[PDB]
Amino acid sequence: MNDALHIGLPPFLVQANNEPRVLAAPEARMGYVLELVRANIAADGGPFAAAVFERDSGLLIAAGTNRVVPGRCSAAHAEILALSLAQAKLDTHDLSADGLPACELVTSAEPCVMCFGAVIWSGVRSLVCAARSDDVEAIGFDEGPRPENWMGGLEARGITVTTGLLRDAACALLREYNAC
Amino acid sequence: MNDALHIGLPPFLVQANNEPRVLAAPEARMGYVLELVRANIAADGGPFAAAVFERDSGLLIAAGTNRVVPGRCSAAHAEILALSLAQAKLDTHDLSADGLPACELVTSAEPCVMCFGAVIWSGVRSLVCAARSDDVEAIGFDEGPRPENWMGGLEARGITVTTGLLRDAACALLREYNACNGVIYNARC
Numbered sequence: 001m002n003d004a005l006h007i008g009l010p011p012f013l014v015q016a017n018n019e020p021r022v023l024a025a026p027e028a029r030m031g032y033v034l035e036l037v038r039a040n041i042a043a044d045g046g047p048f049a050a051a052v053f054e055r056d057s058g059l060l061i062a063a064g065t066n067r068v069v070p071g072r073c074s075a076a077h078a079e080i081l082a083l084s085l086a087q088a089k090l091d092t093h094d095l096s097a098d099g100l101p102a103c104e105l106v107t108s109a110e111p112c113v114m115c116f117g118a119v120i121w122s123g124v125r126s127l128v129c130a131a132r133s134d135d136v137e138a139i140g141f142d143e144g145p146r147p148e149n150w151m152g153g154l155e156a157r158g159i160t161v162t163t164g165l166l167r168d169a170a171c172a173l174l175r176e177y178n179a180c
Numbered sequence: 181m182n183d184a185l186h187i188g189l190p191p192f193l194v195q196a197n198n199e200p201r202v203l204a205a206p207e208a209r210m211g212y213v214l215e216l217v218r219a220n221i222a223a224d225g226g227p228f229a230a231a232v233f234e235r236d237s238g239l240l241i242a243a244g245t246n247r248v249v250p251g252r253c254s255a256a257h258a259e260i261l262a263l264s265l266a267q268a269k270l271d272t273h274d275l276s277a278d279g280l281p282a283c284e285l286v287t288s289a290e291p292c293v294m295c296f297g298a299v300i301w302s303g304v305r306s307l308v309c310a311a312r313s314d315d316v317e318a319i320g321f322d323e324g325p326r327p328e329n330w331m332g333g334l335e336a337r338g339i340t341v342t343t344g345l346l347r348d349a350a351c352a353l354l355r356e357y358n359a360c361n362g363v364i365y366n367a368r369c
């Protein structure tokens with residue numbers, strides 16, 4: 001781009017970031033995130049997606065997917081895209097800015113060490129994961145050197161963590177990606 | 181864009197990325213990354229800069245700076261920008277892809293935990309830092325929860341780590357940023 005770092009997004013993902021969605025139940029939020037996984041694989045991306053929602057309402061704020069290969073950008077993990085697009089939409093770099101509602105990142109899989117970092121600086125107050133890190137390793141993705149007790153590390157910084165939500169459904173999509 | 185991840189580059193950073201530049205010595209590369217720190221603080225960004233070089237020729241591939249506040253993006257650390265812009269120019273996610281020259285990330289401070297992870301994924305083979313984690317913490321920033329022995333973890337993944345290079349000057353700049361970052365107007369800022 002020359003005068004910007006610009007990561008374009010495939011049509012289904014631009015649509016996800018510009019369509020109204022309020023999904024109140026945690027599993028509804030995760031189900032939608034898993035639909036973005038499948039759309040992403042069809043759009044040449046990795047089998048990972050994530051979306052930022054208002055924690056209480058379930059209003060979708062932004063979504064992201066793994067666009068590393070087609071985007072030529074190793075930082076383009078789903079969590080980075082979802083967090084950055086939510087910040088852009090809300091016009092702030094910090095999702096816990098006074099007066100903003102609490103934000104939650106709903107992710108198809110436990111975060112790698114980069115995304116662990118990004119979650120901490122983002123301002124989100126909640127993280128909900130579907131596939132576990134052993135599930136992601138089992139299809140050839142590396143979580144990298146996260147610290148021991150990364151979940152506790154998040155909790156100590158005010159981010160409550162849920163894991164294993166619709167895990168089996170997320171794993172079916174991981175195993176599919178791997179098989180092809 | 182709500183249609184894309186888009187972090188615009190200030191003009192001095194477009195300039196840095198446009199102009200061919202070869203810096204052979206570690207100190208030369210770092211001296212230049214420290215010019216960008218000072219330019220970035222003047223262009224409303226954080227006191228941090230980084231650049232990707234060809235390790236064995238010193239050719240500059242891309243530079244980045246902290247644009248967290250001006251770019252409304254908490255992901256927009258120097259290292260993230262430099263890595264990603266380098267990737268974009270060379271048209272690969274992997275700086276270690278076949279046929280590419282080995283790359284080195286030269287950075288004004290030790291990476292926070294996010295950037296540490298970015299460095300592992302990026303395909304650079306060397307990381308060279310100026311200010312230490314304690315330096316940046318001393319002006320109130322926080323590197324976050326890096327794993328124990330993060331430097332050894334890099335070397336275990338084949339990424340050579342050097343720290344402390346022009347640390348005194350990089351520390352001078354952090355203090356200068358610190359001294360200017362308050363709300364009470366002060367003319368000499």
Ligand SMILES: Nc1nc(=O)c2ncn([C@H]3C[C@H](O)[C@@H](CO)O3)c2[nH]1
Pocket residue numbers: 121226228229245246256257258259287288289290291292295316320321322323324
């Ligand atoms: N190396 C490096 N480059 C950057 O651009 C940068 N920006 C911030 N930091 C450190 C301190 C903050 O608490 C935390 C910022 O949220 O991480 C950085 N470290």
Ligand SMILES: [Zn+2]
Pocket residue numbers: 077078079111112113114115116
């Ligand atoms: Zn990640």
Ligand SMILES: [Zn+2]
Pocket residue numbers: 257258259291292293294295296
């Ligand atoms: Zn960082």
